[PDB]
């Protein structure tokens, strides 16, 4: 229990599930946005060529 107080994270079960869900959807959103950025950049490069 002292180690638990040391780590200092509430880590509630409901909080755990919610947090993992939100951060994972953030991860996928980031990846998709980066892919969109790459696609648009390639389109612009094609336009220049």
1 three-state secondary structure: coil
Question: What sign does the CA torsion over 22, 24, 28, 31 have?
Answer: positive
Structure tokens at 15: 């909080």
Compute the distance between CA of residue 16 and CA of residue 24 in angstroms, rounded to an integer.
12
Give, in degrees to the nearest 5, the angle at Cα 32 between 31 and 34: 65
CA–CA distance, 15 with 18 (Å, rounded to integer): 5
Question: Reduced to 3 DSSP states, what percent helix, strand and coil does the chain have, rounded to the nearest 5?
Answer: 85, 0, 15
Residue in the structure block whose two tokens are 């953030």? 26
Distances (CA, A) of 11 to 2, 4, 30, 37: 15, 10, 24, 35
DSSP 8: T
């Amino acid at each position: 229990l002292q180690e638990m107080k040391d780590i200092g994270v509430q880590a509630d079960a409901n909080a755990e599930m919610r947090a993992r869900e939100r951060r994972d959807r953030l991860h996928e959103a980031l990846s998709v946005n980066r892919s969109r950025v790459n696609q648009l950049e390639k389109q612009i490069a094609f336009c220049e060529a």
